[PDB]
Amino acid sequence: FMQHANVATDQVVMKSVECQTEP
Amino acid sequence: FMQHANVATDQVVMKSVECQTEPV
Amino acid sequence: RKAVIKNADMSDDMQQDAIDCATQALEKYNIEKDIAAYIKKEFDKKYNPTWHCIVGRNFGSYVTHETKHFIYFYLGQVAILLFKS
Amino acid sequence: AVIKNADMSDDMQQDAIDCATQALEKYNIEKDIAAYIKKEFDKKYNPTWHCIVGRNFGSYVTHETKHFIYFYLGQVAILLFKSG
Amino acid sequence: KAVIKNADMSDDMQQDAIDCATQALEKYNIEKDIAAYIKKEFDKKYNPTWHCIVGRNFGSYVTHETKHFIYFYLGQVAILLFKSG
Amino acid sequence: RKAVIKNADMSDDMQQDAIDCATQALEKYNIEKDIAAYIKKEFDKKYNPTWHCIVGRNFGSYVTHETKHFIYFYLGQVAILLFKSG
């Protein structure tokens, strides 16, 4: 029998963020 | 017939750069 | 995005179908693991088992494929390896 | 050595790791590392093997039973399986 | 008025960067929102991952993928846009 | 010379290290690009590539960073953005 494999490299969780300097 | 394949991803070249805003 | 064929041992029609199928996959998924699953499964139905697919930005490979059943190409920044064995 | 997924005998699992350790010592390029491992397993355990070496990729493959391994060696991920 | 101080990028992308930035300044007043618009647009158009800085007074040291960097002014406002990851 | 952390996704030790490194940077350099270069280079060495640093008094930003590798803070009147991506 043949088996299916679904593997991938480790995922580095990413975050997006806003920054604004004060007046 | 079976063929062999030897391929690899392109190297992603990184560059560093300085930036400075103009004097106001 | 833009399709760029680096290496191919495959018919012109099949090559284009691989690109089209991969184009659909990127529109459907963002995860490389899921994108590869779609492409492999699609080619198993259309052109019979057994296909294998690798999707990513950084990898090297050494594989054996059936003649006229191999393609290696980019869609934007993503590399796609697709072959039958 | 870190085994992420495996459907393979313990002796072969150990042999794949050993072969990959040798590969890393000889080569620095992923393309060469994969080539060494594939050829080695084709010689030892008959065709047809396939090998993927890299840090960023996703995959969906079909393998013969008891002939599949996916693991890390340091910072490098290695996929090895038999199909055909 | 667009003034390019430094650039490692294709001419099409550069022009697209300026247009995209031009739209942003017309729509938003807060620099962070201007940067958000430009970043999000380039992530969709030219794949992740982009980063954008918008302001009149800052200095920076960043690492970018080759042919994916631009630094320019739109009037008195400086815009840094680059891809890394 | 008062350190004020506005936003952070980073370990306390790294955060404290970011402040210390920036304090050294301000003591050594006066040009904002040089201050940023010092901090970036130092964090690339200590905590692996790839870091990016923004130093200034007036800017807004939208960036993407790896988890637990982001800090945005002031040292006195100067704003410093430091994050890892790639």
Numbering used by the authors:
A (entry chain E): 181 to 203
B (entry chain F): 181 to 204
C (entry chain C): 4 to 88
D (entry chain D): 6 to 89
E (entry chain A): 5 to 89
F (entry chain B): 4 to 89
Could you pull the original sentences from the published paper?
C. elegans DLC-1 is highly conserved with homologous DYNLL2 (dynein light chain LC8-type 2) in mammalian cells. Recent research showed that DLC-1 regulated CED-4 nuclear accumulation during apoptosis in C. elegans germ cells. SAO-1, a suppressor of aph-1, contains an N-terminal GYF domain and two low-complexity domains in its mid-region.
We further resolved the complex structure of SAO-1 (residues 182–205) and DLC-1 at 2.4 Å resolution via crystallography. The complex contains four DLC-1 molecules that form two dimers and two SAO-1C1 peptides. Each SAO-1 peptide adopted an extended conformation to interact with two DLC-1 dimers and thereby produced two similar DLC-1-binding sites in SAO-1. The DLC-1-binding ability of SAO-1(187-189-2A) and SAO-1(199-201-3A) was partially diminished, while the DLC-1 interaction with SAO-1(187-201-5A) was completed abrogated.
